[PDB]
């Protein structure tokens, strides 16, 4: 998974 | 060498900015570079020929990390770098990274397109603070990217910078919708696997999905009541389990676009609507 | 100096062990020291007068960190350190730490009883590898503790070592009942306070208590199904919220003593019986 | 809180 | 031990603050501690007997590093530490540092008065975060200082804390006049000696004095035009060459007290008036 | 591959020196390398074919960092590397760095001419201790530089080594005139800008120029009375403000060539004559 | 670019393993990789097209650092990388390192064959954890090596992996005979030179040879009585002085092959027979 | 406090040296300190009362680390510290370390005699750069040592400094005979134990003794042919196995005193005569 | 010298 | 500026 | 020299 | 053992 934001 | 041609074509349009590099996009004096070259500024530009204009930063996107500078054309014609297109880039194509670290020459490094994210370009061309903001060329000498220093370097695809060119030339705020959640792709065989480790933080409700790993401070996600450990299952009614995928539908939604979220908090069934704010 | 008397009284009974120190408890050749001086051994002892006996380790408690060595009395009488009692220790009493780091003298340091845990003695007497396993004396020269190196030092209370003396002289396993849970004292105003932080691991079911912070591998707690984040509320029907307090009732229960546990896992009501094993 | 064990 | 008496006298009045220590000054609930124990707060106090009052910080002097806390007396009488006087302290006197690190006992360490600055007390008593804000006692058990953690510790003299007691009890701002210059004592034989080193920053105009080493941002000294390398010679007409001495006449002048300064900038003769502001 | 040809052409003439590399310049046994490969020596040379001659260092220029070694031709003809010319180097030309790290093969790395100082060559060819002293080739296999280890490497231009070849073959001291001053280019808008910072070392007398930043010990500049903070304005009557430029006229002057210097020390007008010594 | 062809040829057969890369050797599902990618495993394979098979490790050579994985062909034909030969590799040939770090693309880097050990390949192609286990291609796109991460990278020659392919496909133990001695090439002019340093460990009996520098624990050499400082002179009657050379005759001898050793221990004449065991 | 008396007795005679401390030995102006306080000097002395004399260093013993300074008595009588004797020191006696770090007061720390080497004094009195060179007092205030900074400090015994007082007052070279060998006490059960480790440097010829561990450069031992690994057995005919003991007989022999040495080099029987030189 | 302020 | 020397 | 093993 | 010297 990535996420970011 | 074929690179000598390429460099002779776009190299004279590669400037020093003050640290970092940039390139002149047209005879008007529109200059591209990295946002992180423009420590917020509001600058000074040196051409390869020694001419020092006085540039001002008419736009900045911190999240794409590119900026538009403007200088005033006087005397000799501002040399101009031809823009290519990044859409048709092939892995293994020659890539030439040009910088102007002092303001009187080009430092040039050579490599290939190592991988393609359209999203991001990697290359084994030496990319360093000396050529950051500078252009990345194909074998013909047209720019297909913007070098970005942080053995493999990165470059912002050129078609990406074309899109937000006018916006950063004019009023510099690009729509970057977001909600503020760090998600992770969870698998049942990672979930009930997690659930059998006695020292795991929380029990995941089995399933596959996006496990909310962190709620960032002062974000729409926080304001909607979203908690760490929540598992978002269906946006409005679209099953999701990919973090990359959710990073999209939020973008296809506007700014200030209310999005409902079906998630389960352990056992409970939770539906909340977050309002997409601007990443800043 | 009054310390010179004290040292003249117990100092000749302080020996080198081989690193660390020890002291002779009686004319039989019973020697006290730290378990961590006896890297498991099975050793060599040097008296202050230069006599080198050959000691063997007849017992070890790793968790109390003290050992019993035995040497065979021959020739001159083994000098003997008088045992005092730690029960009547007053904070602020003089404390003298004696070691025999080389095997021909005493290194002596002076301070006070800094704090009293009965449980553990702290002192501002310089405590170092040179005097570890050695005795800590009161102003009269009777041992009230065993120095333990790791500006404040620690010492094992003497009355504590008196208790397990015979056991370590004979068959060396002291009953240390345990269940294997790292607990933490939780408060409602820490609990529902935790519950309002969106990025806290798990929601605590409000209340006050012992929040199970970690279940250690291969422990009774693990085997009973206890999970991190569980909140133990009543052992059999005794309300608890103190980690120090629970560390007791387990001890007052034997080894292999089944203890039921009332706990709640978020919302659910959980009762499990753990069987106390030996800490090792 | 303490723990130990 | 004589220290046991002392500790029995003031020890019950030594409290935990929440990290740090403090002591109760009278039955009203006036508590002394370090300003750095009160991370600005506005706290919680635990007595040696386990009683937990709720304190609030009614004053703070960051530059003297001491604070006044207030608790509300209820039930049993608040134990009270007798205040001695630091004026008659002799180097070599016994010093006892008491803390209450957990809130149920005293950690006590023993040493002597190592040196006397009236200005600051040094002692070889172990001074650590566990006893900071706590009192330093003489052999009779009256407080002569306030421990301050940062083998030699420091303590704020008690007579110093007596002076600003009411002020910090009431409205908490103590007059600390200043001008904002880092000075250094210069000697001719350091000056013309400096002047013969070809790589020294600036040539000092020979003489003896206070060489302005640094002008701090946003200070009266900056606003008066004072520059690094200036040499202040006569305040109004008082020859000075001591940094310690100038740190005084500014204090004997009020707040907002205009002071002229005779200084020479290399060759030029400079007179400027700085207005003393409050150190903050 | 075209590089295979190049390597087959000059590679057999690349030797190991003993650490570092070198190449044979003619059949006489004249070998080029780095001065820093010849830790002062007075060595041993291994050819690609395994032949071990015994070399001696007949010259060294520490400041250009290149040395000449001599071996005695016997048996088979010493292989010889063709010398190209660095004058016509184009940025972007292929560059091949060859070393002989063990003495039985060539390690070969490939890149381009990254930038051109004539003064210094940079390349993105991997340059490391294994190929240092070794040659840098163009695509045809003629040497255009000497690798110098310290992702971009450096190489000494070949035409530079041609110039001092005989001198280092014979009596090894190359004229490196100097005065011993570390200068910095100063701008009015940096000068009076410096002058408005209250904590700047010295006030610069406005103007543009070469601010003497440091006078090095035991140099002509020191002996002429030059001080840190001096501003050299006119050599004999030639206005200067470039550090690079002054680094030249000293060279065009001989060794032991007296040069007057117009400079101002704050306010004062200063003219001094320095005598150029040899950099060593 | 010519590399685009090469990558289009072997790139689809480059897989992710789970970290590391691998490539499919034939349509059966025989996959090559590094032994250090297979942390002993017994794995999961992702093709460039996204297909996830489930592989198992049917062989491992830790000392050559390569493994054979097996997957079961179903649906579309498993893409296959053409095997070239490393015997005819020329220094300076193009080398293309391909990896599949995520499991949906190829990261590709370009360089040359830097040096040839047949024994080991070095290249200035960026070799990193992302392409380790992946293939190294020539300009035509046939694999000539296996990338091995640890600016110059290493690769296992392909002909080497061809040899032990079946063995690792079947029962995975490759004959690696050894004796367990760390040797060093000694020279008389290093020997009697060593012998004149008063602080050298042992005096070497002059001569040239293999000085036993270390006897490793639990090795045939230890069991044969071989000591540090011994000098092996003649195996059975073959004079040796090369560490590389002795590393061979042991291999040409079988496993469990008794080899006599003529060595001298200072002055004494020593003959011992070691039995070659398997390196593990 | 009893220490206040002691300090009032010797404290006024404790001076600052310029970093370090010292004390005045008599009214003539004879001052003791550490050799390492006198960085070779040839100094400046500040008394407790503020008087600044100008001292010169009339002697230095680097190996004992003590120096004699001389100042010229003028005006008020130079205060004088009473010299005690270190011969009758008892472990556990009070020890007071006095320094004069600024030149206007005494920093005083208190502890006990921790151990006695006559050879060296250890104490748990805080010993630091502020009191180094300063005196260590007994409870009556007579100096029994000289503090030496490097929780336990060291001090040079006073009787030791008495011995070389005149010599350092006059011509400053004290007889320190030596041979230059680093020896180690070896035991048969360490020797043949060493001999069974296959990777030990050299085989020790069994026995007990002094194993020469290192021959130091330019020493009599080197010049006599002594090698590392030699085992000295009998000086002239006195069996030795103690490193401490051999460090003596060399001293009882003069400077330039030829001493024969019976040693065995592995198997061989070796007798060499070394001539004792001066340690420097 | 001291400074401070 | 450069310096050197 | 090398060693290995 | 000690050494020194
Ligand atoms: Na004490
Ligand atoms: Na390349
Ligand atoms: Zn590269
Ligand atoms: Zn102490």
UniProtKB/Swiss-Prot annotation, chains B, C, E, F, G, H:
Belongs to the peptidase S1C family. It holds the Pfam family PDZ_2. This is Putative serine protease HhoA. InterPro entries: HhoA_HhoB_HtrA-like, PDZ, PDZ_sf, Peptidase_S1_PA, Peptidase_S1C. Keywords: Hydrolase, Periplasm, Protease, Signal. NCBIfam families: HhoA_HhoB_HtrA. The keyword Signal applies. One of its GO terms (cellular component) is outer membrane-bounded periplasmic space. It comes from the Bacteria.
